RNA sequence: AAGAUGAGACGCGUUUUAGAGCUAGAAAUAGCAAGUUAAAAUAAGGCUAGUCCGUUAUCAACUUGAAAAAGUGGCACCGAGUCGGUGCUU
DNA sequence: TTGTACTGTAGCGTCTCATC
DNA sequence: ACAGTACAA
């Protein structure tokens, strides 16, 4: 009748248990299915469900944002092509066609292999005239001559494809900048600012830095490149030209952070500085060649030809980084003389720089706007079409999705929240007139802020909400905005006004929700007639933070008791805090509860995260048709040590199930304060139904490194048309699940229709096409007449029973895993962990040394366990000469101290432990790696379907198939 | 303090192609010159065709069910190489 | 021509917004 | 876990 459930919850495992009152796990005879001759199995009512750890959604988020990024960038290019198509179809209609076909090989291209001009001599002349695109950019900015439309489009597409960061919020012209010494303009309205930077900053540090410079009639008589005006301290206050000089000096110091020198009068200082970089690289390469030919001709072959030895050829043609190439070439220029300028340029990281470099991420989008506005102002008179819609392309650079608007979905996304005012295709030119920025912006903040735990229909209150603030002031008086909005109202009595204070809630609601100037203005529109213009243009600055955790016993409410103070099963669980791994664990635990109540005739049993877990599992008693107890590990460990069965992870998966058992034992014992003689036998049975959960593998298709072209057939076609023979592709695809098939395949030059039984490994993208039509897909892979009703679906950790109890765990269609665990007597483990790890078992009183002198007789087990590994490895691992290796290494180091050999037998049990084979050393040397590539040996085995508890099986004998 | 989700952006990398290599060469190969950039893609792709979605989560098997979802399997004892048997029961 | 033994392979770094 | 090379038939 009566029984209890033991449970533990973890990232990867859910141990489960069944205990009748005197600490005894029952043992019962069960029923199986399938075509096997077995019809009754015996298993103890104890087990552990092991599964892969849950993944966080962060990687999918970074990928999803990346996909949206590339999509919108391609759309920007598409818009610019849409603009230029009408005019440049006159000069070259296939120009965009060649641009899109530039990836293809010469035969695959539908036009000439030279994209920019479609002929060799013009393309060569262009490349000679403009060594980089930046030469074209600078030429188009500076020269007033009429340009080819094609070069204009290259400049514009390069501009918008890499349009720079948007951290700089205002408009800006680049020619305002000057050397760090520009602070002389602040003086007349020293050392560069970097000596003052990278230090402590505060209001007092600001004060002392300003006072350390010379005072005068002005705030400083000499400003000494001080901190406060150049650097923002750690439209508002516009009601207050030192400010303008401070602003311009800040623009100067930023533009010196990005750009070096801008002497020559040009509107494209970025292109100028980078052409300076290019020309320096040219001159230094020529000097390098001359010096290496003069001094060291033998390393000339290594450096300038070998792409593998991290030379300059490795730096350009190979994948060498700038830092690694610098650290390679630095000793070469150190021991060889005449390269002091080379060393000082290397120490400045300005030596042989490329154009497209990882450090370009500091440049703002206003620089590209200045260059782009400049080229349109240059070419407007030659091409009136540019003058027709100049602001459109300018907008394409400046346009951005606002961070509060979200994805521009027509109600089909699972993340989007935008609210269009019209059913129009959103363009950068008409974004704000279509999208209701108001509803979308308020939807951003409301959809993510929580409801009250007592009232789940409405949002929690702001911390500074006004009638809530008066309620909280009343609460504090019985048991800040009163002193704050006194300033804005300029009266305390009208702050104490009561009648019209619900709208007064709604202003502070607005200023707690929104941050944007125009948005606060548009939502403050409602209160225009109550106040004058100056006071509400000052009031819109009152940005609020914080949300209060509330809503708007003998019959007492929570407030009255405070006067004497002293649904979806998925979504109710998934919404909690904590890692996604423990959420997967508790979902498995809920399924464990459902199965454990299903099995026994529907008989019910008798930190902050698990506090939530206890309530959510106690909800079951009235939601889904069991006293939920908060256990502690202390008495569990005390019972383990006192009754001489110590907790161990290194041997086997076994003690997680014994921990679930002892969890139920301690819970029943504390609700209750023979069985003490029962517990040591209960941990002593070697049959516990351990269930490795079986999952289809989801994730990326492959390792992401696109491997170069090859003649192999295992390259993955990264596009449909892109044949991976020529274009390169991915390797190491990830298996989804194995599919056992029985069919016939023709083999040999004289082909014969020979029957076959083998398992194919499906992968993630063809999983959809496989499940759409398995027979036609399997036909396409080559199999004739696959037996449709015998297609068996075999995901990872599918389990197979072979002869003499040997079990193997399916890793993939080309790889197995070990499926068996050994089980020592408990006295062996007691001897081991009293010998091994003194420092983390001892420190308890002298009974620890008493049980040490109970296990001193067990030194013979340092041989006997080697006999156990030999026996079990010959039985179910079949390790062949590796057994000879470990036995030999054992035999030469038996005479070592007990502690260290005990630790090293702990190190050997990585052989016998469940799952993958892994190397180990014992004392001396590493065992060579092994892999069970043979999936052949399970084709005649007995397949095991194991339930979530594993209690309910369906065994299939594969040899009876086909 | 300690971390979880979602939105907007940037810059590299990778791959293929374009950037005419020259001389001595039957040739094998040797000497020499050049090298900095661009285009396209960045999960195959999907249809509700959106400037949206595609790596998070769910999932033993079987019978129903497009799916969702529901259903499908005895007890007592003694032993224990991973569970075995006995007897009762219909 | 089809299976085993052995060693080698693996996309990445910033920035801005909101809360539990 | 899968690849690539190097051998046993």
């Amino acid at each position: 009748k009566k029984y209890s459930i033991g449970l533990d919850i973890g990232t990867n495992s859910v141990g489960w248990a069944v205990i009748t009152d005197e600490y005894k796990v029952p043992s019962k005879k069960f029923k199986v299915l399938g075509n096997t001759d077995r019809h009754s199995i015996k298993k103890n009512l104890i087990g552990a469900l092991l599964f892969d750890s849950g993944e966080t959604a962060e990687r999918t988020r970074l990928k999803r944002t990346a996909r949206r990024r590339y999509t919108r960038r391609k759309n920007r290019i598409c818009y610019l092509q849409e603009i230029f198509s009408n005019e440049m179809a006159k000069v070259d209609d296939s120009f965009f066609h060649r641009l899109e076909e530039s990836f293809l090989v010469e035969e695959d291209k539908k036009h000439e292999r030279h994209p920019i001009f479609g002929n060799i001599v013009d393309e060569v002349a262009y490349h000679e005239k403009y060594p980089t695109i930046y030469h074209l950019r600078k030429k188009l900015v500076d020269s007033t001559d009429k340009a080819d439309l094609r070069l204009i489009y290259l400049a514009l597409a390069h501009m918008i494809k890499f349009r720079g960061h948007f951290l700089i919020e205002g408009d800006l012209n680049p020619d305002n900048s000057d050397v760090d010494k520009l602070f002389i303009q602040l003086v007349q309205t020293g050392v560069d600012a970097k000596a003052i930077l990278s230090a402590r900053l505060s209001k007092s540090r600001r004060l002392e830095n300003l006072i350390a410079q010379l005072p005068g009639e002005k705030k400083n008589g000499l400003f000494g490149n001080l901190i406060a005006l150049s650097l923002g301290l750690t439209d508002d206050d516009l009601d207050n030209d030192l400010f303008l000089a401070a602003k311009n000096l800040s623009d100067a110091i930023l533009l010196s952070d990005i750009l070096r020198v801008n002497t020559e009068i040009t509107k494209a200082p970025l292109s100028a500085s980078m052409i300076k970089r290019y020309d320096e690289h040219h001159q230094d390469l020529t000097l390098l060649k001359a010096l290496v030919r003069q001094q060291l001709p033998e390393k000339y072959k290594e450096i300038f030809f070998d792409q593998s030895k991290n030379g300059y050829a490795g730096y350009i043609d190979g994948g060498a980084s700038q830092e690694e190439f610098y650290k390679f070439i630095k000793p070469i220029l150190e021991k060889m003389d005449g390269t002091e300028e080379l060393l000082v340029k290397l120490n400045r990281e300005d030596l042989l720089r490329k154009q497209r470099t990882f450090d370009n991420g500091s440049i703002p989008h206003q620089i590209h706007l200045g260059e782009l506005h400049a080229i349109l102002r240059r070419q407007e008179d030659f091409y009136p079409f540019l003058k027709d819609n100049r602001e459109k392309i300018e907008k394409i650079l400046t346009f951005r999705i606002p961070y509060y608007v979200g994805p521009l979905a027509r109600g089909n996304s699972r993340f989007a929240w935008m609210t269009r005012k019209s059913e129009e295709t959103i363009t950068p030119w008409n974004f704000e007139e279509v999208v209701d920025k108001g509803a979308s912006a308020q939807s951003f903040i409301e959809r993510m802020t929580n409801f009250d735990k007592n009232l789940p229909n409405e949002k929690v209150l702001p911390k500074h909400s006004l009638l809530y603030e008066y309620f909280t002031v009343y609460n504090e008086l019985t048991k800040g905005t009163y002193h704050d909005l006194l300033k804005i109202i300029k009266d305390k009595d009208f702050l104490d006004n009561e009648e019209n204070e619900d709208i007064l809630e709604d202003i502070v609601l607005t200023l707690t929700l929104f941050e944007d100037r125009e948005m606060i203005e548009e939502r403050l529109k409602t209160y225009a007639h109550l106040f004058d213009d100056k006071v509400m243009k000052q009031l819109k600055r009152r940005r609020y933070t914080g949300w209060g955790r509330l809503s708007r016993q003998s019959g007492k409410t929570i407030l009255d008791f405070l006067k004497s103070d002293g649904d979806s099963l998925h979504e109710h669980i998934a919404n909690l805090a904590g890692s996604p791994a423990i959420k997967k664990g508790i979902l498995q635990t809920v399924k464990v509860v459902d199965e454990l109540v299903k099995v026994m005739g529907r008989h019910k049993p008798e930190l902050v995260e698990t506090r939530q877990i206890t309530k959510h599992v106690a909800q079951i008693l009235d939601s889904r048709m069991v006293k939920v107890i908060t256990l502690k590990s202390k008495l569990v460990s005390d019972f383990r040590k006192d009754f001489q069965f110590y907790k161990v992870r290194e041997i086997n998966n076994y003690h997680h199930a014994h921990d679930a058992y002892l969890n139920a034992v301690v819970g029943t014992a504390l609700i209750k304060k023979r069985d003490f003689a029962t517990v040591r036998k209960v941990l002593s049975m070697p049959q516990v139904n351990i269930v490795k959960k079986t999952e289809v593998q989801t994730g990326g298709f492959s390792k992401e490194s696109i491997r170069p072209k090859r003649n192999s057939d295992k390259l993955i076609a990264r596009k449909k048309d892109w044949d991976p023979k020529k274009y390169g592709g991915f390797l190491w695809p990830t298996v989804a699940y194995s599919v056992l098939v029985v069919a016939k395949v023709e083999k040999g030059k004289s082909k014969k229709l020979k029957s076959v039984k083998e398992l194919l490994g499906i992968t993630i993208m063809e999983r959809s096409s496989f499940e759409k039509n398995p027979i036609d897909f399997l036909e396409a892979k080559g199999y004739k007449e696959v037996k449709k009703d015998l297609i068996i679906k075999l995901p990872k950790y599918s389990l197979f029973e072979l002869e003499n109890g040997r079990k193997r765990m399916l890793a993939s269609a080309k790889q197995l895993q070990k499926g068996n665990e050994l089980a020592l007597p408990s006295k062996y483990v007691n001897f081991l962990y009293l010998a091994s790890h003194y420092e983390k078992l001892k420190g308890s009183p002298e009974d620890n040394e008493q049980k040490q002198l109970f296990v001193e007789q067990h030194k013979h087990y340092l041989d006997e366990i080697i006999e156990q590994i030999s026996e079990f490895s010959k039985r179910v691992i079949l390790a062949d000469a590796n057994l000879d290796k470990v036995l030999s290494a054992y035999n030469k180091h038996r005479d070592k101290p007990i502690r260290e050999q005990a630790e090293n037998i702990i190190h050997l049990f990585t052989l016998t432990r469940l799952g993958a084979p892994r190397a180990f050393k014992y004392f001396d040397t590493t065992i060579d790696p092994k892999q069970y590539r043979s999936t052949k040996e399970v084709l005649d085995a007995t397949l095991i379907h194991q339930s979530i508890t594993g209690l309910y099986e369906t065994r299939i004998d594969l040899s009876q198939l086909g």
Side-chain angles (χ1 to χ4, degrees), chain A residues 280-292 295 304 325-326 329-334 336-352:
Chain A
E280 169 271 2
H281 180 302
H282 188 320
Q283 292 157 31
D284 267 316
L285 161 64
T286 292
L287 262 58
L288 256 284
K289 280 187 181 189
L291 289 177
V292 65
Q295 293 196 34
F304 297 78
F325 162 65
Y326 283 0
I329 214 78
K330 193 177 188 278
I332 288 302
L333 308 185
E334 273 167 0
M336 146 191 193
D337 74 12
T339 59
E340 281 70 359
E341 318 86 11
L342 293 201
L343 267 289
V344 75
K345 291 174 94 80
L346 191 147
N347 291 341
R348 288 197 299 97
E349 283 43 49
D350 201 9
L351 159 62
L352 287 184

Side-chain angles (χ1 to χ4, degrees), chain A residues 474-654:
Chain A
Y474 180 124
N475 191 57
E476 182 173 43
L477 182 64
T478 305
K479 294 298 187 182
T481 306
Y482 179 89
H483 307 290
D484 196 338
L485 177 37
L486 172 58
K487 163 44 218 81
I488 308 175
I489 287 168
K490 300 284 282 288
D491 177 35
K492 214 277 297 189
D493 184 43
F494 231 77
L495 178 52
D496 288 334
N497 190 354
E498 179 70 22
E499 174 57 23
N500 60 16
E501 208 176 15
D502 85 350
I503 328 303
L504 273 159
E505 298 277 46
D506 157 79
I507 308 78
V508 56
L509 214 59
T510 295
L511 326 183
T512 317
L513 289 172
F514 303 76
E515 267 278 28
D516 169 283
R517 299 289 196 206
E518 144 63 18
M519 296 290 332
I520 292 168
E521 271 310 317
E522 202 32 62
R523 302 289 289 202
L524 189 149
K525 150 205 62 55
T526 307
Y527 331 100
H529 65 77
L530 291 101
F531 288 101
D532 64 271
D533 294 40
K534 167 35 53 173
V535 71
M536 62 47 51
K537 293 161 185 290
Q538 149 282 299
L539 151 67
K540 57 148 154 69
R541 305 179 187 179
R542 187 47 277 193
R543 169 61 192 160
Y544 291 98
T545 56
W547 292 88
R549 296 280 288 177
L550 290 171
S551 173
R552 54 144 301 289
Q553 284 159 227
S554 305
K556 301 298 179 181
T557 68
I558 299 174
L559 179 61
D560 310 314
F561 188 76
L562 177 149
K563 302 182 180 181
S564 55
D565 192 25
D567 197 10
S568 175
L569 180 62
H570 322 77
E571 300 189 343
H572 206 94
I573 294 174
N575 78 86
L576 308 179
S579 73
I582 66 171
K583 295 182 187 181
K584 167 176 192 181
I586 86 174
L587 270 293
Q588 298 336 295
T589 325
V590 168
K591 301 320 301 172
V592 158
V593 166
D594 165 9
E595 291 313 348
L596 280 179
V597 77
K598 174 182 182 291
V599 152
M600 318 172 137
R602 319 309 219 284
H603 164 281
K604 315 308 155 303
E606 311 87 60
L607 178 55
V608 179
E609 311 315 321
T610 188
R611 293 263 61 72
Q612 286 290 343
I613 289 174
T614 46
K615 182 179 181 179
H616 298 149
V617 76
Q619 287 164 340
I620 300 189
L621 266 171
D622 291 338
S623 306
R624 287 185 52 66
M625 329 328 269
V626 199
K627 303 305 297 184
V628 190
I629 299 154
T630 298
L631 272 299
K632 300 185 181 76
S633 60
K634 278 64 174 181
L635 189 59
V636 153
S637 300
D638 296 341
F639 282 174
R640 283 184 156 283
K641 295 277 281 290
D642 293 347
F643 306 127
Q644 75 254 43
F645 36 79
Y646 311 153
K647 180 173 174 168
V648 46
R649 310 348 307 153
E650 49 266 72
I651 296 167
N652 56 20
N653 277 265
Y654 223 121

Side-chain angles (χ1 to χ4, degrees), chain A residues 112 115 119 256 261 322 554 670-671 677 693 718 770 800 844 847 879:
Chain A
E112 180 52 278
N119 68 294
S256 34
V261 172
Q322 184 190 267
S554 305
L670 279 293
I671 66 81
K693 195 213 151 193
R718 54 173 299 199
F770 172 61
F800 295 79
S844 72
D847 191 65

Side-chain angles (χ1 to χ4, degrees), chain A residues 746-752:
Chain A
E746 315 97 307
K747 300 140 53 42
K749 307 99 214 181
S750 55
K751 66 99 191 170
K752 70 216 174 310

Side-chain angles (χ1 to χ4, degrees), chain A residues 300-482:
Chain A
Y300 176 81
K301 189 72 171 185
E302 167 178 48
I303 295 173
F304 297 78
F305 291 90
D306 180 6
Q307 318 171 359
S308 100
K309 266 270 189 208
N310 190 255
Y312 163 85
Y315 178 61
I316 302 307
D317 302 304
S321 59
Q322 184 190 267
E323 171 279 340
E324 190 189 359
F325 162 65
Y326 283 0
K327 92 175 288 188
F328 159 74
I329 214 78
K330 193 177 188 278
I332 288 302
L333 308 185
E334 273 167 0
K335 75 196 79 66
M336 146 191 193
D337 74 12
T339 59
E340 281 70 359
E341 318 86 11
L342 293 201
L343 267 289
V344 75
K345 291 174 94 80
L346 191 147
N347 291 341
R348 288 197 299 97
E349 283 43 49
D350 201 9
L351 159 62
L352 287 184
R353 309 216 87 197
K354 296 170 189 167
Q355 279 58 84
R356 303 307 294 270
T357 324
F358 67 126
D359 64 357
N360 287 335
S362 299
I363 75 193
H365 71 284
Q366 288 88 348
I367 289 181
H368 300 281
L369 309 144
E371 311 215 20
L372 202 172
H373 180 232
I375 165 63
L376 282 159
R377 290 302 193 169
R378 289 294 190 221
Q379 298 298 323
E380 52 186 29
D381 69 347
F382 306 114
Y383 284 75
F385 178 40
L386 316 174
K387 169 57 54 175
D388 298 348
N389 48 357
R390 200 197 86 258
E391 75 302 345
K392 286 184 69 180
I393 301 73
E394 289 204 16
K395 189 56 175 177
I396 312 174
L397 202 166
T398 80
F399 173 71
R400 191 152 60 105
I401 295 332
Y403 72 83
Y404 50 63
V405 161
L408 302 190
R410 193 193 270 170
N412 298 327
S413 150
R414 86 177 207 74
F415 316 99
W417 67 79
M418 98 160 172
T419 59
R420 44 178 62 239
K421 302 189 303 302
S422 193
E423 311 315 280
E424 319 307 324
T425 88
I426 298 162
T427 78
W429 318 302
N430 73 339
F431 178 80
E432 91 295 7
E433 71 78 20
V434 177
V435 174
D436 183 348
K437 286 165 59 88
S440 320
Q442 63 149 319
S443 311
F444 170 50
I445 184 58
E446 66 61 31
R447 81 200 295 291
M448 72 53 67
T449 42
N450 72 292
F451 304 125
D452 181 40
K453 79 206 83 63
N454 301 93
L455 254 287
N457 198 291
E458 57 163 40
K459 303 308 188 179
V460 279
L461 318 152
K463 183 177 288 186
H464 302 341
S465 187
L466 191 81
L467 252 170
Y468 162 102
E469 260 285 270
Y470 264 57
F471 148 81
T472 309
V473 159
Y474 180 124
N475 191 57
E476 182 173 43
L477 182 64
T478 305
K479 294 298 187 182
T481 306
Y482 179 89

Side-chain angles (χ1 to χ4, degrees), chain A residues 186-187 196 200-216 218-234 242 246 249:
Chain A
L186 195 76
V187 178
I196 291 166
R200 194 64 57 84
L201 187 60
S202 68
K203 186 176 179 180
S204 305
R205 196 269 175 139
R206 178 284 311 180
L207 187 162
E208 74 185 35
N209 181 256
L210 269 63
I211 294 296
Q213 326 314 314
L214 309 181
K218 301 176 195 292
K219 187 169 67 179
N220 281 95
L222 181 66
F223 285 74
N225 214 348
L226 58 82
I227 189 73
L229 297 178
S230 189
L231 293 319
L233 299 173
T234 184
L242 182 285
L249 152 62

